[PDB]
RNA sequence: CGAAAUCGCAGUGAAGAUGCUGUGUACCCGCGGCUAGACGGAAAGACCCCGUGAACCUUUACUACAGCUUUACAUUGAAC
């Protein structure tokens, strides 16, 4: 799974930079928990923005 | 229950004859009894054998399946 960082988390890497996560860790920890967004054009533009 | 003008004996005969041979006996027809025979009636023998027949049962017969169980992947992630 592709996903834009929301905030610093260990091992993955910076703010607002784009990772390859294991679909599990990213469907049911981050992106519920609000720490990233799904890699997608609309999510990119709403970060940059 | 094929139809009968439906006797005994010794033989003969698909090998135990009311029906064939020889012979003996016997006038025609009932009624009351009897069950020696009509291999009597009844049930396409269940005993036995056969059929590349059936069924159900058993098992360390064959081949399978349910169930149980093992591991690989997915649901399934993170850190040391």
């Known amino acids: 799974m592709q996903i834009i960082l929301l905030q610093r988390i260990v091992n993955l890497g910076k703010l607002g930079e784009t990772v390859d996560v294991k679909p599990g860790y990213g469907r049911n920890f981050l ?19």
Request: glycine residues 6%; neutral net charge.
């Open 31 to 49: 992106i519920p928990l609000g720490k990233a967004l799904p890699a997608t054009a609309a999510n990119i533009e709403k970060f940059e923005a």
